[PDB]
Amino acid sequence: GNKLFNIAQRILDTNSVLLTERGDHIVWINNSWKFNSEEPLITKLILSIRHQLPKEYSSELLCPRKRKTVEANIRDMLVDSVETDTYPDKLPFKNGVLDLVDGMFYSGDDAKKYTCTVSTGFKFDDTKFVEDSPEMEELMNIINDIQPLTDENKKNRELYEKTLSSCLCGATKGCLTFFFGETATGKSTTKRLLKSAIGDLFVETGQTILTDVLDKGPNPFIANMHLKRSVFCSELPDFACSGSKKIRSDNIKKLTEPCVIGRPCFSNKINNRNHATIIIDTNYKPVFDRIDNALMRRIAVVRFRTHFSQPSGREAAENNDAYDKVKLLDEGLDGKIQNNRYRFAFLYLLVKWYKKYHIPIMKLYPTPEEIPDFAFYLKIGTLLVSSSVKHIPLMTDLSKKGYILYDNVVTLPLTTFQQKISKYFNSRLFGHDIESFINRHKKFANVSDEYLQYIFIEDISSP
Amino acid sequence: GNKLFNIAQRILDTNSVLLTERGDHIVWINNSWKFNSEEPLITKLILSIRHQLPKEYSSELLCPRKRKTVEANIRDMLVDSVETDTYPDKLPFKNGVLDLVDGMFYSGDDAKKYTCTVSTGFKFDDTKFVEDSPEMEELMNIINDIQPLTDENKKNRELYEKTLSSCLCGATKGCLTFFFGETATGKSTTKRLLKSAIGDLFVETGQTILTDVLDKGPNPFIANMHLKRSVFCSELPDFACSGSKKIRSDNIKKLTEPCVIGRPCFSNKINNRNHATIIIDTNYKPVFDRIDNALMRRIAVVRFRTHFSQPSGREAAENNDAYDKVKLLDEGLDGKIQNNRYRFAFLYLLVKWYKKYHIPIMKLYPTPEEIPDFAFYLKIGTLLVSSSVKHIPLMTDLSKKGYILYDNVVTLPLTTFQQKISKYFNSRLFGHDIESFINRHKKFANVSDEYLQYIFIEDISSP
Amino acid sequence: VETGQTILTDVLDKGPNPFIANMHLKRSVFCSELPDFACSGSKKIRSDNIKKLTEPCVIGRPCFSNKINNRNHATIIIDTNYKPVFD
Amino acid sequence: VETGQTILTDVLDKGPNPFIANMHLKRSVFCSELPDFACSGSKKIRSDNIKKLTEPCVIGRPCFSNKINNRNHATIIIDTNYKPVFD
Numbered sequence A, B: 001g002n003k004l005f006n007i008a009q010r011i012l013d014t015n016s017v018l019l020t021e022r023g024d025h026i027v028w029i030n031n032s033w034k035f036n037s038e039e040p041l042i043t044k045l046i047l048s049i050r051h052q053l054p055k056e057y058s059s060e061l062l063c064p065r066k067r068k069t070v071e072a073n074i075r076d077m078l079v080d081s082v083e084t085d086t087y088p089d090k091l092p093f094k095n096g097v098l099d100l101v102d103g104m105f106y107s108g109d110d111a112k113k114y115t116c117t118v119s120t121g122f123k124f125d126d127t128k129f130v131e132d133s134p135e136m137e138e139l140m141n142i143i144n145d146i147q148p149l150t151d152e153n154k155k156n157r158e159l160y161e162k163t164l165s166s167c168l169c170g171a172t173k174g175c176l177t178f179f180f181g182e183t184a185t186g187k188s189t190t191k192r193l194l195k196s197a198i199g200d201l202f203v204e205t206g207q208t209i210l211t212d213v214l215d216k217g218p219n220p221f222i223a224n225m226h227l228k229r230s231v232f233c234s235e236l237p238d239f240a241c242s243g244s245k246k247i248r249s250d251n252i253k254k255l256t257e258p259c260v261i262g263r264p265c266f267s268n269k270i271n272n273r274n275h276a277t278i279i280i281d282t283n284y285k286p287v288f289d290r291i292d293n294a295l296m297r298r299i300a301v302v303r304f305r306t307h308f309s310q311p312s313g314r315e316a317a318e319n320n321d322a323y324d325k326v327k328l329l330d331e332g333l334d335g336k337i338q339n340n341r342y343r344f345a346f347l348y349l350l351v352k353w354y355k356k357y358h359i360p361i362m363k364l365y366p367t368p369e370e371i372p373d374f375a376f377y378l379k380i381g382t383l384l385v386s387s388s389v390k391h392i393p394l395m396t397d398l399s400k401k402g403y404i405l406y407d408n409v410v411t412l413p414l415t416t417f418q419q420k421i422s423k424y425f426n427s428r429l430f431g432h433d434i435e436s437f438i439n440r441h442k443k444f445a446n447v448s449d450e451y452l453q454y455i456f457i458e459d460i461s462s463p
Numbered sequence C, D: 001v002e003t004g005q006t007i008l009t010d011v012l013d014k015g016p017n018p019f020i021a022n023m024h025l026k027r028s029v030f031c032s033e034l035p036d037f038a039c040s041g042s043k044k045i046r047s048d049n050i051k052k053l054t055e056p057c058v059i060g061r062p063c064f065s066n067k068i069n070n071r072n073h074a075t076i077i078i079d080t081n082y083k084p085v086f087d
């Protein structure tokens, strides 16, 4: 017999309480997978589900000392763990799961299949998910004001759209995106609109994750990056002045792996799932201590070219090279965006961009040509070519040019190599970088006589 | 006769609960030895096992207040510990144990004998664990693409196969492996294949273990690498600039030991079993604190020399000396690898490699000749020969050489030592190494003190 | 028992130090992998800890325990490839 | 009770000092082999600590504690072959 065990068995049959691989119980309440560790929810589930049981059982789940017994049975009857958050194309709302690829919306049991334990936190209203509305027109005008639809701004606008649209996709992204531009360009407006659109899947964390060591001790500023689909960090401490701690390349290389290592306070979990699109907002170019191909492989940049200025400075805004258009600053827009007026309009816009840009595999791409630092490392790769075995037959021509040969290796004097390199690049402008490049790749050929087995591309091509 | 005690005795007689020296209470549920200090599993085992007990006892174990009583009895009945996880040639799966020496898969009672307290975490499908299948063909193609089967890459591929196959052995591996290579070469793909093949016997950890104090204080980055068979700390902090903490040699020595000291905080434990083979996916050659002969024995390296360039940058990579081959990137390969596709094919390949490379004893061997940072103390070994008694019979030759005969030894002045060091290597590039060697190996000879009683290797070999 | 080298390179009392607590009433304490002090850049072994280890009783407690004294019956052996240094 | 020179150089109260709490009701405290300040580098005998050790009360709280008031009865003796130096 034991009525309470029968009730526990039925509640297990409905398949509502589950055990995760992080050792925590997720319950299914109000058409959403709720999850908590300091306020256990199993008694809430028992009291909520008491309606579906027969009449002889529902009158017994009213005493707390019996809901706790049913809880004990349930906890002792769960042995096998399950894996959660395995679908990367479903957006979970506080009352269901919107399917991005098909466009349909599921609620109730239909949404139970997809174990999504991080929801936006606000209900999905199907009367606002419409293309035609005054809010949609106002939002479209605002977006066209922030990023104009001109001819010279096509690529930058497309990259902006792709970056904003990736905030819906629940996979791991392979770039970091920098929003760059002068003051009053609309970057924080995009931040606030995006937050109002995707709710609790948006987290703002300090700059410490980009400068401090990830592991160290406790570091909740990265332990809160667990499963959130957008991490947006602002106010880069411009490094033009001295005393500014530069950005570390290994931090960039560590914020791209599908799992970052960092733990909260009073916790041992040191593995966080990294679904987040990381967007860093800055008005000044960033500085990297070490630059290589790996760092150039994980940087993207979006530039803002519009100033919303009050008339008292409009003339001052009309005489600057850092903009391309000046508009009237709106005093009441911050209050309107704060009130979540453009929430579902922007969610619809985001879903349309997601459908457009999601060619069977959507991948964030890097743009190293727009960062001033990487120009030096790109031009050198486009100017100097390393000699190899295929150039052995033309060794006489290389010797006639001014090079020397030793042990089937082409080499030139260090001072001669420096003069040849400085023939097309500024020695004083990038002295430290040039010295680092020369020393790092220096490989002696003969006894001492340090040299580098690389020659100018134009010199090699020209006989 | 106090029925609950009879039930406790009956459950204890089957040897399903055991006490380990650390104080853990491992329980045998669902063909696996689970243990969890958070939610004790003894009540779970009682409820699971009530089926086998007689009809009178079975109905008594439906009330939590009685399962707690039986658990108390069982806890008070276990007075003797037991040694766990002793057999190092067995691979524990979530539904049994695979005998790596033979190949048979044991489940149920036959797999109970081995007190393997860790598991991969997934079932073993004998249908997929097969030699021929499309997944096997694609996986073999990928592996041959990462490390080519060419004759020049013979030793490298052999070491690569051995380093990966040592992830199945349950012994205490005696070396460290460095996955070193340029960007976009295949290190992360191999890490993900290994992570999806070995399962939960694989953990990622930060760089604190290799750069900071192992003991210090509470360090969960060492408590989690207990009984793990593969630890994959990665992303070394770009030691090219030499502006960051170097990996302390003491850490390297303490890591390659049968026990590693960590986690002095709570949940009693101070020592952890170092079953793991540590692989550090680097990007530049490592920089150490103090180079010694002991640290020359506990370090290896595997070099990846095949690029996976985008079609736009195929030409640029085709002219780089850091790549011995250039191929075209596959966009959806990572999606398939992370989707647990090549999970059993790679386990089969690893088992085959394990059988191939396992002589009567398998041992990892270092390759210190690869690391440039270890060259100088190696070069000194080939450039300096200590005084030998049998070399005394060269009086005329010693007089012709110019050495000073003092205390039945050949000594030279400090200026002569500096001249010999300059003639042995570049002064600027090896001044620190020469000074450190002179300071460490200084003896009592020549004028006053600070004299090295070691002749040049060529001079010592010569009469 | 084998414990890390925090015994020689830090204040004995400090906070909770289970490393010294597990040495309670032991006989053979091996500590290995001592850094080379010839090259600057490593904290040296303090003479205070060396003097304290020779006392009959040593101070230090485990975590979630009120027992703060531990008898020093042990022989401490440090395995090092380089000569040690002291303050 | 026998204590080291830890109180003769560092701040008397400062942080959690075991000897600060151990001076509670102990009738005698002895320090031996003082860290001679004659050679350059060694800290001078802390005049603040010597001045603060004379009062009939002891202020000090160890780790995981709140009581800071101790009755002082100990006679303090220092033994060494070097003349003390106080800045």
Ligand SMILES: Nc1ncnc2c1ncn2[C@@H]1O[C@H](COP(=O)(O)OP(=O)(O)O)[C@@H](O)[C@H]1O
Binding pocket: A141, A142, A143, A145, A146, A182, A183, A184, A185, A186, A187, A188, A189, A308, A327, A328, A329, A330, A331, A333, A334
């Ligand atoms: N569409 C718009 N029309 C008019 N003013 C706008 C518009 N979008 C933004 N603004 C103005 O810019 C502000 C938001 O951008 P702001 O935070 O000033 O940018 P930044 O953070 O880059 O300095 C708004 O509060 C308003 O003052």
Ligand SMILES: Nc1ncnc2c1ncn2[C@@H]1O[C@H](COP(=O)(O)OP(=O)(O)O)[C@@H](O)[C@H]1O
Binding pocket: B141, B142, B143, B145, B146, B182, B183, B184, B185, B186, B187, B188, B189, B190, B308, B328, B329, B330, B331, B333, B334
């Ligand atoms: N055999 C292969 N064929 C094609 N692309 C591959 C192959 N192996 C890996 N790749 C791709 O190469 C890219 C970079 O590989 P990865 O190992 O992550 O580089 P890194 O070693 O620099 O971390 C990814 O797109 C990955 O899917």
